[PDB]
Design a protein around this nucleic acid. Structure first.
Lengths: 209, 120, 114, 121, 56
RNA sequence: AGGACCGAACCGACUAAUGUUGAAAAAUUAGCGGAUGACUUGUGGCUGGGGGUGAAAGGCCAAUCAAACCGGGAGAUAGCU
RNA sequence: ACACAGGUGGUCAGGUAGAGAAUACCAAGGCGCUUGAGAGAACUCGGGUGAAGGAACUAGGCAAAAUGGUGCCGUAACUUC
RNA sequence: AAUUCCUUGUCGGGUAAGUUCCGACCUGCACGAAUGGCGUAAUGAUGGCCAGGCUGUCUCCACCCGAGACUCAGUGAAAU
RNA sequence: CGAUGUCGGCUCAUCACAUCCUGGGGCUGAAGUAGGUCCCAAGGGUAUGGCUGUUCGCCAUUUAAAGUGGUACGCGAGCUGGGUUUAGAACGUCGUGAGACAGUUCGGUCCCUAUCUGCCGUGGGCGCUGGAGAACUGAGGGGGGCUGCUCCUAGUACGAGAGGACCGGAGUGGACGCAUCACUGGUGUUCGGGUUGUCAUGCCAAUGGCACUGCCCGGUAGCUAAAUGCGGAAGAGAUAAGUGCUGAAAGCAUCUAAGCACGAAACUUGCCCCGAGAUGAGUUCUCCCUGACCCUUUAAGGGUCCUGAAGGAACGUUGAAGACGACGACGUUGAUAGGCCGGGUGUGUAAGCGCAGCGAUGCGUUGAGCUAACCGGUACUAAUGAACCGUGAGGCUUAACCU
């Protein structure tokens, strides 16, 4: 089915009667307002652009204002597109969004992962540090060999070396949907979704399930 | 890494940072306007403003706490006598930072940090 | 935020007793071995922490037979059913790790509104 | 628990200090301490115990300082690391009587005898 | 460490292509006194946005 | 009394780390060994190069030593580059 | 070679704690070591603290960690007593 | 054996596992009596081994504090 | 040889298939279980220790297995120096001796600030044809591709028994990768307390400086693993070995020659990420700019004034973003940081006073007082309105449409 956009508002535990302490991530999946639907004639793909949240309309640009003005002038924080296989959706917004996530049992969550800076090799990959004390002149966490002498004479394109980690899209699949609360627009999903609290999130029904 | 972390090191150890901000708070209380570098003024807000917030209520325990965090009895007397009533109505924001130009010896962002109800 | 922890306030148990660290408490924990469910008593000196919301816990140490067993108990968990305060201990710290690790160390009882 | 770990013995026939020479089960398994079976040498033994010094046989860890985590988040930590000695081929308890606390995590297969003999579960 | 061949004057200029200074491109004008100042800075005769704030 | 012990000044230099275009043409920092003796130190003096001096290492003789440094034979010679 | 982390003989020796010329803090006296301002990546250096296990590390317990004082008891093999 | 090539000699020990160690055997390639032989308390910044304790040596690293590294202003080299 | 560092180990790899495991088969002297041999198959995986310097080797114990080779017997401007490969010493042997040993033994200096290619990250400039603000298509590229144990079927098939199913399901783990910080922990020199020595604030009292944060005991945020979540799939297509159907050349025969069908962890997709500089520079939506003059060497072009738009950039407060750029929020129509208010937390009953005591000290006010980066609020402070850049209707060839 079509996914929805929510804002991550934190991690808690839910305590069942047996006492299993399910780690829930609550997501504020507010009502998603369609801004565009694409027909097969105009574009090759059939999809809905959706917006959520509020934007003040001081910071709304007039191109975005005209795009908002078509299909009902309500500014949101962003536009995200979900491709549809079969189901037809209007250009106006749906009233409640988590009602479609009521039936689904496992979900996939996409988010920008937290920025980890210029991570080293030991952090970025799981490199094993060399021995601390016996000798080891100034080479404790440095990358060791990166290539294999004259015959390659170069280091390959896929080489595991230090760089920026985080600030990247990562999807976690097959997360159990613990609770759907329509009134607060809240979706409680088992486990840990990517990103910091307050970051944007893409919630989709499970491709695996 | 630095996530949700307060505190500016300013390339000095914790004892020097504490001593430096004690002396800077004493100078700011004494003259009511000082010129510092801009991050120094910005953390000077964080040391100086709770002193006046403590100094709103005058008691022997509060004067002793202000003496603990300043070690200058003249500054304690000024905080609990001259200032304090002046900033009693003010709900925070006793400090105003006005950015000046750049220092001569090192190109450092310079600022004047001042008390808001300055007599001058 | 406020949208979170209203759910915590929904799940927090309202029957939690009040005890200082040092008190020798008894916790009755449900155990579901099969269809049958039975309460189990765990009594020992408290090394706890103040209520962090739904996420609250107590550590209790008992010498069962030659072995010092420490159990951390989730306060608002449904498995924790009843905590009885029993003996009250007067001690000058919140965390009693050093006092509990010593063998033959017995905390005093003081009843002076404390 | 880990390799080169000394453990006490709960059962009577197993004697005194024992050392984990191998963490059985797994290709590169580093640490195993809840209901896992570990290969054991006897580093020091009393003569009343049936087993003797320098003898290799299996064991099951019953008490761990790291402790088990219960489903609700409860952590039962037992002071001391303890094992119950088991035969190499049979994995059955040599000791007739188990001493000290045991956990409900050791409720599977041959460890039912261990929790049956041991007093506090 | 060392180079095997001398880098060229061309490659020197290409490296210094991105080493160039940036102009101010705007100066705010204070209402009370006509002097131009760096934006959010004191006017160097003692004025901020509309008022005299330092004696010097 | 002690070529006694522990240990500062003092004298030396056992391991490691940093340095290695260094702060330094052998140092710094943690630990180390002797420290009433065959100790250490100041000030002068004596021994001169196939010579000295050596609790002996081809050690030392001015950051130079299986033979110092300076000038001379000397533009030695070089079937080699 | 330097406004160089080295080397340089003697003399005086305050308080408190301390056996002490150790060391800690202070007197008197002298200084902050002639580049500074930020930010708080990897990595490097010098440190601090570590769950559980504890020499499995490694060529080797290298390094680190521990023990450490004064008083009273008590103390083995061997021995040139 | 500071010596034995074969050799990690053979046994017994210490470990789960011991070319090291310790103690015997003699089959001394190629010990042997001031070119000293055999022992020896004490002593050793000596060589080899085994324990107790202790710990980031390790499993497997994690966080923190300072000096650099990054940026900004000033001066401003090197090998090739 | 006017110099190409030598074994091993550590860290990090990549390729081949003469395949160790996992997959598919054929033959078996394959009843089952378990094997042997051969073919196809490189996607993933492929131990820890003792001895010794070791590659080796011997052993102890794992595992599904602990492959074989190439890569200067990979890898010293990555690390080590046990090894060899120096100068000291000693022993055995040879030589009269200096000395020697394809003998032994103890000891014995391993330097580089990265120009270029190469990678790993991250930017600037211009292009994509009027300028913008968005959302995407997917040409290509990368990541991921492992497996054990138990139970059902079933003690069934198979079997004289002993034993015991290459199908098909279910759980549960190991190693690996990714995210996260709700829990359990660690850290937490930026919180609280105890305490030794000394000095200071006149003194008592209360505090502060210094001694590794003086030593400690605890600890919020943040980060993190040892904590918890999640995943490597099922499919789909084309196939390899292989098994076939129909079927002649070769009235029989035959898996092949025309045809037809299955057949693998390999291939292509399916899962995730990048991605139009994809110069082949793509698509969709929206906003914005429609004034003159002079010269004029006409895809033509210049100069001048007027007007500068959509938007961007600069500046400032900043961020769970960051080496710097970059990116994200907010800028008085304002909650973007600091402060303030209330809470939460953490530490553990502050100072002061009174009481008991000879005093140390205790008890009461008192779960007090302090409290961090946290939560909810609040314009008290700083986020000033300018200004800057960006234009004025967008080139030539074949279409409806009406002139």
């Amino acid at each position: 089915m079509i996914g929805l956009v929510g804002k991550k508002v934190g991690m808690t535990r839910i305590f069942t009667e047996d006492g299993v302490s399910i780690p829930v991530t609550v997501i504020e999946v507010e009502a998603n307002r369609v801004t565009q639907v694409k027909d097969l004639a105009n574009d090759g793909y059939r999809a809905i652009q959706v917006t959520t949240g509020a934007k003040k309309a001081n910071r709304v640009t007039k191109p975005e204002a005209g795009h908002f003005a078509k299909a009902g002038v309500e500014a949101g924080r962003g536009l995200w597109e979900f491709r549809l296989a079969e189901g037809e959706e209007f250009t106006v917004g749906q009233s409640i969004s988590v009602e479609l996530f009521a039936d689904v049992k496992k979900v996939d969550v996409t988010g920008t992962s937290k920025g980890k800076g210029f991570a080293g090799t030991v952090k970025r990959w799981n490199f094993r540090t060399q021995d601390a004390t016996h000798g080891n002149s100034l080479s404790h966490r440095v990358p060791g060999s990166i290539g294999q002498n004259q015959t390659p004479g170069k280091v390959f394109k896929g080489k595991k070396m230090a760089g920026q980690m985080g600030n990247e899209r990562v999807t976690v699949q097959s997360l159990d949907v613990v609770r759907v609360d329509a009134e607060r627009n809240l979706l409680l999903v088992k486990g840990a979704v990517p990103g910091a609290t307050g970051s944007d999130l893409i919630v989709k029904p499970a491709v695996k399930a | 890494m630095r996530h949700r972390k307060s505190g500016r090191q300013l390339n000095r150890n914790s004892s020097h940072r504490q001593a430096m901000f004690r002396n800077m708070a004493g100078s700011l209380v004494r003259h009511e306007i000082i010129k510092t570098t801009l991050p120094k003024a910005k953390e000077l807000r964080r040391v100086v403003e709770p002193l006046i917030t403590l100094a709103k209520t005058d008691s022997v325990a509060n004067r002793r706490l202000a003496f603990a965090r300043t070690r200058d009895n003249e500054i304690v007397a000024k905080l609990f006598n001259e200032l304090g009533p002046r900033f009693a109505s003010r709900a925070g924001g006793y400090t105003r930072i006005l950015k000046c130009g750049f220092r001569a010896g090192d190109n450092a962002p310079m600022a004047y940090i001042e008390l808001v109800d300055r007599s001058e | 935020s406020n949208i979170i922890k209203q759910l915590e306030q929904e799940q927090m148990k309202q029957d939690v007793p009040s005890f200082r660290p040092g008190d020798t408490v008894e916790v009755k924990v449900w155990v579901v071995e099969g269809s049958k469910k039975r309460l189990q008593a765990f009594e020992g000196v408290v090394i706890a922490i103040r209520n962090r919301g739904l996420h609250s816990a107590f550590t209790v140490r008992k010498i069962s037979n030659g072995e010092g067993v420490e159990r951390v108990f989730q306060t608002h968990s449904p498995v924790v059913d009843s905590i009885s305060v029993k003996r009250r201990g007067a001690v000058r710290k919140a965390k009693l790790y050093y006092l509990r690790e010593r063998t033959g160390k017995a905390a005093r009882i003081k009843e002076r509104l404390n | 628990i880990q390799e080169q770990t000394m453990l006490n013995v709960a059962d009577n026939s197993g004697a005194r200090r024992v050392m984990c020479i191998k963490v059985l089960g797994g290709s590169h398994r580093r640490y195993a301490g809840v209901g896992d079976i570990i290969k054991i040498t006897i580093k020091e033994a009393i003569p009343r115990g049936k087993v003797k010094k320098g003898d290799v046989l299996k064991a099951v860890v019953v008490r761990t300082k790291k402790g088990v985590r219960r489903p609700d988040g409860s952590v039962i930590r037992f002071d001391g690391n303890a094992c119950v000695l088991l035969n190499n081929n049979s994995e059955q308890p040599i000791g007739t009587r188990i001493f000290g606390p045991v956990t409900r995590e050791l409720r599977s297969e041959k460890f039912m005898k261990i929790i049956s003999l041991a007093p506090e579960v | 460490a060392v180079q095997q061949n001398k880098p060229t004057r061309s490659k020197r200029g290409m490296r210094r292509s991105h080493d160039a200074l940036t102009a101010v491109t705007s100066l705010s004008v204070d209402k009370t006194s006509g002097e131009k100042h760096l934006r959010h800075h004191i006017t160097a005769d003692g004025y901020y946005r509309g008022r005299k704030v330092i004696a010097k």
